[PDB]
Amino acid sequence: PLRLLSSVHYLTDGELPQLYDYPDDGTWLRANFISSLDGGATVDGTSGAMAGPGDRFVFNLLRELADVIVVGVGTVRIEGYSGVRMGVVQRQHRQARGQSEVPQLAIVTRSGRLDRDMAVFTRTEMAPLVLTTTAVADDTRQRLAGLAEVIACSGDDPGTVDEAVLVSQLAARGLRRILTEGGPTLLGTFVERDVLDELCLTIAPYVVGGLARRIVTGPGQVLTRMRCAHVLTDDSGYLYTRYVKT
Ligand SMILES: NC(=O)C1=CN([C@@H]2O[C@H](COP(=O)(O)OP(=O)(O)OC[C@H]3O[C@@H](n4cnc5c(N)ncnc54)[C@H](OP(=O)(O)O)[C@@H]3O)[C@@H](O)[C@H]2O)C=CC1
Ligand SMILES: CCc1nc(N)nc(N)c1C#C[C@H](C)c1cc(-c2ccncc2)ccc1OC
């Protein structure tokens, strides 16, 4: 029943994006996270310490393929969260794929409490989207006029975000190829409401002890079965995996 894996195939620079192709139609919510061997998501608050050149490469490539990046407000506040920086060649490939110069950025909040002076608003080329509830949308739209387009993503309850609606709200705006990179609360909701189509997980060859939290936090408890689509590796021992529901 058991089969041993090993490096069978070197990936040319055009084969690697075909592995991470989005579906030709429909909407698709992809998660990219990185994790240690013992399920540690962070090393002293950062996740950048476990990320080597390999992971970074896949990380930027995934950004290059996305119409939009969804991020929770907690992650966006953290020390050195930039605006999405597309290099000159990345912008080229995106144009050849008919996408815009840079992927759009969507910030999720239930509270609507974002500042006019946040890092995310200030040095991003293009004005980010704010995904929040019906309850707070209008006041948030006012408080951030000229910084962000504020979009209500409530379903049946005006006091919260319905994650399936969030996703549909993005598709509505031609932003059907979605990517999320954190934080663990947002991913938590995406998993609990079962709207996560695909998980891209980097397994860093480290153990970090028991202090770090997982790539997912929250009260949720589910058993979502996924299919292994591929596993990649480099000389440093990392595993770059792709899993699809169901
Ligand atoms: N796994 C990794 O690799 C990552 C690890 N981290 C680490 O984890 C910590 C941050 O964790 P967290 O604060 O959970 O990161 P988040 O990005 O998940 O911040 C979550 C915020 O998003 C808003 N929100 C509103 N509706 C939703 C919804 N439906 N789903 C999700 N979020 C929603 C809330 O903001 P409001 O309160 O305004 O409603 C909530 O507080 C940091 O210490 C950082 O070091 C950070 C990034 C990625
Ligand atoms: C590159 C790290 C990383 N790898 C993988 N496989 N999945 C992820 N979700 C993240 C991540 C991350 C968080 C969002 C993050 C990355 C980076 C970052 C990404 C790429 N190069 C330098 C920094 C900076 C700040 C960050 O949070 C504050």
Give the Cα separation of 60 and 32 in Å (integer): 11
Distance (angstroms) between ligand 1 centre and the Cα of 198 equals: 19
Query: Residue 135 burial (CB < 10 Å; 0-12/13-18/19+)?
Result: middle
Atom 1 (ligand 1) nearest CA: 215
Q: Tell me whether residue 111 is annotated as binding.
A: yes
Please say whether the beta carbons of 95 and 71 come within 8 A.
Answer: no
Technique employed here was: X-ray
Distance (angstroms) between ligand 2 centre and the Cα of 51 equals: 8
User: What distance, in Å, lies between the first and last C-alpha atoms of the chain?
Assistant: 22
Q: State the total domains in the chain.
A: 1
CATH number of the domain encompassing residue 47: 3.40.430.10
Residue 189 near ligand 1, beta carbon < 6 Å: yes
The type of residue at 159 is G
Query: At 140, is the secondary structure helix, strand, or coil?
Result: helix
**28: containing domain:** 1-246
Both tokens of 45, joined, read: 């608050």
Contacts of 92 (CB under 8 A, 6+ apart): none
Distance (angstroms) between ligand 1 centre and the Cα of 21 equals: 27
Give the Cα separation of 102 and 97 in Å (integer): 12
Give the Cα separation of 127 and 151 in Å (integer): 13
Q: Kindly provide the b/e burial profile for residues 213-233, where b requires at least 16 CB atoms within 10 angstroms of the residue's own CB.
A: ebbbeeeeeeeeeeeeeeebe
DSSP code at position 50: T
Atom 17 (ligand 2) nearest CA: 48
Q: Which atom of ligand 2 is nearest to the CA of 78?
A: 28
The Cβ-side half-sphere exposure at 97, using a 13 Å CA radius, reads 22
Q: Tell me whether residue 202 is annotated as binding.
A: no
Neighbours of 94 (CB within 10 A): 20
Q: Say what angle helices 88-96 and 53-65 make with each other, to 10 degrees.
A: 40
The Cβ-side half-sphere exposure at 113, using a 13 Å CA radius, reads 3
Distance (angstroms) between ligand 2 centre and the Cα of 164 equals: 25
Distance (angstroms) between ligand 2 centre and the Cα of 4 equals: 31
Atom 4 (ligand 2) nearest CA: 34
DSSP code at position 123: S
Q: Which atom of ligand 1 is nearest to the CA of 75?
A: 17
Residue list, ligand 2 pocket, CB within 6 Å: 32-34, 47-48, 51, 55-56, 59, 75, 78, 80-81, 181-182, 202
Residue 161 near ligand 1, beta carbon < 6 Å: yes
Cα-trace Rg, the chain: 18
Distance (angstroms) between ligand 2 centre and the Cα of 124 equals: 17
Q: Which atom of ligand 1 is nearest to the CA of 113?
A: 38
Give the Cα separation of 214 and 40 in Å (integer): 5
Number of helices (H), then strands (E), in the chain: 8, 9
Query: At 190, is the secondary structure helix, strand, or coil?
Result: helix
CA max distance for the chain: 61
Residues in the chain: 246
CA proximity to 151, closest of 169, 168, 163: 169
Residue 51 near ligand 1, beta carbon < 6 Å: no
